[PDB]
Ligand binder design. Structure first.
Ligand SMILES: Cc1c(C#N)cccc1-c1cc(-c2cn(Cc3cccc(C(C)(C)O)n3)nn2)nc(N)n1
Ligand SMILES: CC(C)CCC[C@@H](C)[C@H]1CC[C@H]2[C@@H]3CC=C4C[C@@H](O)CC[C@]4(C)[C@H]3CC[C@]12C
Ligand SMILES: CC(C)CCC[C@@H](C)[C@H]1CC[C@H]2[C@@H]3CC=C4C[C@@H](O)CC[C@]4(C)[C@H]3CC[C@]12C
Ligand SMILES: CC(C)CCC[C@@H](C)[C@H]1CC[C@H]2[C@@H]3CC=C4C[C@@H](O)CC[C@]4(C)[C@H]3CC[C@]12C
Ligand SMILES: CC(C)CCC[C@@H](C)[C@H]1CC[C@H]2[C@@H]3CC=C4C[C@@H](O)CC[C@]4(C)[C@H]3CC[C@]12C
Ligand SMILES: CCCCCCCC/C=C\CCCCCCCC(=O)OC[C@@H](O)CO
Ligand SMILES: CCCCCCCC/C=C\CCCCCCCC(=O)OC[C@@H](O)CO
Ligand SMILES: CCCCCCCC/C=C\CCCCCCCC(=O)OC[C@@H](O)CO
Ligand SMILES: CCCCCCCC/C=C\CCCCCCCC(=O)OC[C@H](O)CO
Ligand SMILES: CCCCCCCC/C=C\CCCCCCCC(=O)OC[C@H](O)CO
Ligand SMILES: CCCCCCCC/C=C\CCCCCCCC(=O)OC[C@H](O)CO
Ligand SMILES: CCCCCCCC/C=C\CCCCCCCC(=O)OC[C@H](O)CO
Ligand SMILES: CCCCCCCC/C=C\CCCCCCCC(=O)OC[C@H](O)CO
Ligand SMILES: CCCCCCCC/C=C/CCCCCCCC(=O)O
Ligand SMILES: CCCCCCCC/C=C\CCCCCCCC(=O)O
Ligand SMILES: CCCCCCCC/C=C\CCCCCCCC(=O)O
Ligand SMILES: CCCCCCCC/C=C\CCCCCCCC(=O)O
Ligand SMILES: CCCCCCCC/C=C\CCCCCCCC(=O)O
Ligand SMILES: CCCCCCCC/C=C\CCCCCCCC(=O)O
Ligand SMILES: CCCCCCCC/C=C\CCCCCCCC(=O)O
Ligand SMILES: CCCCCCCC/C=C\CCCCCCCC(=O)O
Ligand SMILES: CCCCCCCC/C=C\CCCCCCCC(=O)O
Ligand SMILES: CCCCCCCC/C=C\CCCCCCCC(=O)O
Ligand code: NA
Length: 386
């Protein structure tokens, strides 16, 4: 049994290193959003709320975790607060991650009404509401779902604790049925699964819209070929009518290009209906000039916008997946403790790895933004250089 202060020194030193990096990186995120108006959008207000939670992991939750690792004597309800505050920050993170996913889904699924639906003032209200709900969820043990009514008196007496005091240890004061059924299953697992469903819908919507763009492009070029090798006016008419409905479907300098295109289709359709096949086919050949000068530029720009949305949704999904990767080990350990009382408790070294891993999640987001979002990376460079 090596002196506890030795392994404690390693744990504390690692925690302090994580706290420093979590503060510095997420302050940099908040500084970047404040300074750059290209970063001031609803999506990034949730990013800032998420960075604020991670700053508070460094400033408060990590000091609280160090404190409660000592088992020091404390009034049980005071011990509850330092045990549970991190649950508020994790819950706020969950709400921010879910909001980011939903925001990106609205942007990809109804972009025409996004800006009118998703506003900065509405985002700020949602963030306020989510922080209040995070306090209610994370501090629910302080409302009475706690073990303060059944203190471990032998542990308190062995440490010289005063009257009404307990040895302040997370698993002695926070009930494990709360941690497993309420916190993990209901408040963490269900929102993460909802996030997964939203991201699946985002990527499926992007895939469908890109396919729809390519289908309309092929229909345009296919029907032009049909007109060229048509042998009567009715065949020309058939292909032009299919082109006209498709042109309006793709319309839902951009406006000018489609105005020319639909007009040139109408010109050829009128000639077709007069039985002037050769003249209609010549009129339809003009469509190619409009296709090259206008329509192809719209196709490429629409594709480029969708691909950027896919890239941004992947970046956001990486953040959500890394949250799950960092927090799941601690939750899984709690499940073993709760569901398997015949199993030996996870060993002390694994406890400290799982706790430290959950704290490292507050370090990682600034790096994801830097490596994946040019506007962040460039703003980070300007802040650091200056
Ligand atoms: C909070 C949380 C969330 C959230 N939010 C989500 C899932 C799980 C947990 C969580 C957290 C902690 C815990 C313990 N400590 C202090 C500490 C540090 C080092 C060593 C020790 C020992 C020696 C074991 O007493 N104790 N900090 N967090 N313990 C447990 N079972 N679950
Ligand atoms: C906005 C920031 C500065 C507020 C930070 C306040 C923190 C550090 C304060 C607020 C409430 C405090 C706790 C309230 C009660 C107790 C019970 C006592 O037996 C031991 C200390 C302990 C556990 C306190 C530790 C410090 C504490 C967590
Ligand atoms: C920004 C301002 C409002 C600071 C926020 C105040 C918070 C940190 C303070 C105010 C009231 C405090 C609680 C007041 C009463 C008790 C009961 C006591 O047995 C232990 C501490 C405990 C459980 C305190 C925990 C921390 C607490 C919730
Ligand atoms: C999210 C990804 C990384 C999966 C994480 C898997 C981790 C958390 C799993 C894998 C194997 C698991 C261990 C397997 C067996 C035991 C023995 C038991 O007496 C206590 C729990 C303990 C020690 C488990 C703790 C959790 C554990 C370490
Ligand atoms: C989609 C995924 C990440 C959902 C989370 C998986 C969790 C809920 C699963 C994965 C492995 C599971 C554990 C595997 C083994 C045991 C040992 C048994 O004696 C009691 C239940 C217990 C402790 C399980 C509890 C639930 C568990 C922790
Ligand atoms: C830890 C607690 C608080 C940390 C500071 C986080 C909040 C301050 C960051 C300011 C910001 O990025 O907002 C930009 C908007 O104003 C653009 O409209
Ligand atoms: C959404 C709702 C968010 C929650 C805010 C509103 C009300 C919360 C209740 C606050 C009151 C509860 C805090 C004090 C307490 O629990 O003491 C327990 C022991 O002293 C035994 O009494
Ligand atoms: C998502 C949720 C999936 C699974 C939930 C885990 C439930 C696991 C329940 C196992 C507890 C049990 O039956 O033990 C009884 C005694 O024999 C042992 O002491
Ligand atoms: C880079 C930063 C430099 C930092 C410099 C060194 C950091 C650590 C110093 C002293 C540790 C004292 C720890 C306080 C007491 C620990 C209690 C303990 O070991 O846990 C027992 C409890 O009962 C659970 O079972
Ligand atoms: C911004 C302001 C910074 C916050 C102030 C102090 C941080 C460190 C907290 C120090 C906690 C020491 C507790 C202590 O000395 O306990 C004595 C021992 O328990 C005998 O009973
Ligand atoms: C915006 C925020 C700026 C900074 C805010 C401050 C940062 C937190 C520092 C330490 C937390 C740990 C505090 C708990 C210390 C407990 C020691 C203690 O009370 O021991 C005496 C005896 O155990 C009782 O009977
Ligand atoms: C305990 C408090 C914790 C976090 C507060 C951090 C606040 C979160 C920052 C987002 C607010 C924001 O960006 O405001 C949008 C602006 O109001 C559009 O008009
Ligand atoms: C979703 C999960 C629903 C079912 C979750 C399993 C609830 C029944 C198992 C049970 O009795 O829980 C063991 C308790 O922790 C004593 O070990
Ligand atoms: C775990 C406890 C959960 C608390 C349940 C109670 C829910 C209270 C909050 C509900 C969200 C409603 C927000 C309404 C604010 C006003 C919005 C508006 O004026 O348009
Ligand atoms: C997580 C990645 C960051 C660094 C990982 C290192 C973690 C070390 C923390 C665990 C402390 C070792 C326990 C040794 C002991 O019990 O004596
Ligand atoms: C994680 C750590 C990345 C920190 C990058 C260093 C710059 C921080 C300075 C600042 O916040 O203004
Ligand atoms: C510990 C918590 C630290 C929070 C870090 C947040 C930093 C980001 C924005 C703060 C707002 C800006 C304050 C001064 C602005 C000066 C200026 O605009 O030139
Ligand atoms: C920028 C603000 C950051 C706050 C700095 C706080 C850093 C201090 C870290 C941990 C405090 C640990 C308290 C130890 C508990 C007492 C031990 C005992 O009584 O046995
Ligand atoms: C849940 C508890 C409710 C708290 C009310 C928070 C105040 C936010 C109102 C603004 C709502 C909005 O504009 O969308
Ligand atoms: C419990 C007390 C409520 C918590 C207070 C947090 C409220 C608002 C932060 C929103 C930032 C905009
Ligand atoms: C909004 C979120 C609601 C949660 C707030 C909890 C505050 C807890 C106050 C606990 C005081 C305990 C008094 C005692 O029993 O000694
Ligand atoms: C446990 C589910 C983890 C949730 C991550 C969400 C992102 C997945 C991307 C597709
Ligand atoms: C590297 C991080 C740890 C790797 C794998 C986790 C598995 C640890 C299982 C040890 C069982 C503890 C025991 O009950 O004896
Ligand atoms: Na977080």
């Amino acid at each position: 049994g090596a002196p506890p202060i030795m392994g404690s020194s390693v744990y504390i030193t690692v925690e302090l290193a994580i706290a420093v990096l979590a503060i510095l990186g997420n302050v940099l995120v908040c500084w970047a959003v404040w300074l750059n108006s290209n970063l001031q959008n609803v999506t990034n207000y949730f990013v800032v709320s998420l960075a604020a939670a991670d700053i508070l992991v460094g400033v408060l939750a990590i000091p609280f975790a160090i404190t409660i690792s000592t088992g020091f004597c404390a009034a049980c309800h005071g011990c509850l607060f330092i045990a549970c505050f991190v649950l508020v920050l994790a819950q706020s993170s969950i709400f921010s991650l879910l909001a980011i996913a939903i925001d990106r889904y609205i942007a990809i699924a109804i972009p025409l009404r996004y800006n009118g639906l998703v506003t900065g003032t509405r985002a700020a209200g949602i963030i306020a509401i989510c922080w209040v709900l995070s306090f209610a969820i994370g501090l629910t043990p302080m409302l009475g779902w706690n073990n303060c009514g059944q203190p471990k008196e032998g542990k308190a007496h062995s440490q010289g604790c005063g009257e009404g005091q307990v040895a302040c240890l997370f698993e002695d004061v926070v009930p494990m049925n709360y941690m497993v059924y309420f916190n993990f299953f209901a408040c963490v697992l269900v929102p993460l699964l909802l996030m997964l469903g939203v991201y699946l819908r985002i990527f499926a919507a992007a895939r469908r819209q890109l396919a729809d763009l390519e289908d309309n492009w092929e229909t345009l070029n296919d029907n032009l070929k049909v007109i060229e090798k048509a042998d009567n006016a009715a065949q020309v008419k058939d292909a032009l009518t299919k082109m006209r409905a498709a042109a309006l479907d793709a319309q839902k300098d951009f406006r000018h290009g489609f105005d020319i295109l639909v007009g040139q289709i109408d010109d050829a359709l009128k000639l077709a209906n007069e039985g002037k096949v050769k003249e209609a086919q010549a009129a339809a050949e003009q469509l190619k000039t409009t296709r090259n000068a206008y329509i192809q530029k719209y196709l490429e720009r629409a594709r480029s916008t969708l691909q950027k949305e896919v890239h941004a949704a992947k970046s956001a999904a990486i953040i959500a997946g890394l949250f799950a990767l960092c927090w799941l080990p601690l939750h899984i350990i709690n499940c073993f403790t709760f569901f398997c009382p015949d199993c030996s408790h996870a060993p002390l070294w694994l406890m400290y790895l799982a706790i430290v891993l959950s704290h490292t999640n507050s370090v990682v987001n600034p790096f994801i933004y830097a490596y994946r979002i040019r506007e962040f990376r460039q703003t980070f460079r300007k802040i650091i250089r200056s």
